[PDB]
């Protein structure tokens, strides 16, 4: 009678228990099947690996990402991931636990129904619910009206929410997120003269991104500062022992979010999509959206991103608009945290769909 919260993303599954302040399990949303026949010493033949073990044994596997840009597109693989979540990661019997699952903004209704069908028919949960990711991030911040920027590994959305109601006509989706940023960081470090050839070397770049990158408040000025002095250089020590030093790549990498042309995309950057999303909404609620711009997801973790968003939105909005960016320290887990909260509220308990109900539908 303790509920589970499972937040499935393009890159990571965040899974845990309702009432806790953080997921117990965070791991790659990947399934790999052996390309050849054989065994690890002391083990039997495995048909598939999920999560961390799939990544670390990837060279003998074929990997699949069953969640693409936030949406489940491979159901047999998704079943494997949920199987692995219940039994291996959380070590629970799913038939014993009401389960809250999350979904992307604009998830097709047929997709939510397939989720529901698997949880009941395949996993035998007593009860479940599907919440929209962005709405949970907003809830996590103690609010019911605002606009969420949710940027993860595979997808970025803007979601305006009016008294708990995500406004689907105003939702913006941008197919540029953490993965594109890692790939671009690798490209530009390579241009500098570094080399990421082996799997181990290439794996490091994601860590350099997460430890050293940041968003410049004034990109052009930050570029001239970087050319002028070594004040923005930072060193990163490789696992072996070699230390390497990087300057302007630190802020060129996430500047891509504001200038998607850096990776050859012709789309509006995240400040433009935030504005255009607010502008699809009734003029009468815009003030409430501007004053409550909640950032959520791994790719919103860059130092500086909130200040730069405050600046770009200020330049686009009416001159008298009060503008506020909320970026909680925990925002890489905000969706999960909002789920943990919602599933623990007393007013939520009538909202679970039960096995009995599903059978009678």
């Amino acid at each position: 009678t303790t509920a589970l919260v499972c937040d499935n993303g393009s890159g990571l599954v965040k899974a845990g228990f309702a009432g806790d302040d953080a997921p117990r399990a965070v791991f790659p949303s990947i399934v790999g099947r052996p390309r050849h026949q054989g065994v690890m010493v002391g083990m039997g033949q495995k048909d598939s690996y999920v999560g961390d073990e799939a990544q670390s044994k990837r060279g003998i596997l074929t990997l699949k990402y069953p969640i693409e840009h936030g949406i489940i597109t491979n159901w047999d693989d998704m079943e494997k991931i949920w199987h692995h979540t219940f039994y291996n990661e959380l070590r629970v019997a799913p038939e014993e636990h009401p389960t809250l699952l999350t979904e992307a903004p604009l998830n097709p209704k047929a997709n939510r129904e397939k989720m529901t069908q698997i949880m009941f028919e395949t996993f035998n949960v007593p009860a479940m619910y599907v919440a929209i990711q962005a709405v949970l991030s907003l809830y996590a911040s103690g609010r019911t009206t605002g606009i969420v920027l949710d940027s993860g590994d595979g997808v970025t959305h803007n979601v305006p929410i009016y008294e708990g109601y995500a406004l689907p006509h105003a939702i913006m989706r941008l197919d540029l997120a953490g993965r594109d940023l890692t790939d671009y960081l690798m490209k530009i470090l390579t241009e500098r003269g570094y080399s990421f050839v082996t799997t181990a070397e290439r794996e490091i770049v994601r860590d350099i991104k997460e430890k050293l990158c940041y968003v410049a408040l004034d990109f052009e000025n930050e570029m001239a500062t970087a050319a002028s002095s070594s004040s923005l250089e930072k060193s990163y020590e490789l696992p072996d022992g070699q230390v390497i030093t990087i300057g302007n790549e630190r802020f060129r990498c996430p500047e891509t979010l504001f200038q998607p042309s850096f990776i050859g995309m012709e789309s509006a950057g995240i400040h433009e999509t935030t504005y255009n999303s607010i502008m699809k909404c009734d003029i009468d609620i815009r003030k409430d959206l501007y004053a409550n711009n909640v950032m959520s997801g791994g790719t919103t973790m860059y130092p500086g991103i909130a200040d730069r968003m405050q600046k770009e939105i200020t330049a686009l909005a009416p001159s008298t608009m009060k503008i506020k960016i909320i970026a909680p320290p925990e925002r890489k887990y905000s969706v999960w945290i909002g789920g943990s909260i919602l599933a623990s509220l007393s007013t939520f308990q009538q909202m679970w769909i039960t096995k009995q109900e599903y059978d009678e539908a």
Partner: peptide, 17 residues
Amino acid sequence: RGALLDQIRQGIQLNKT
């Protein structure tokens, strides 16, 4: 619906994991 949004705004105390 109103009761729910009320609780959401008021917050819950979450435990250490």
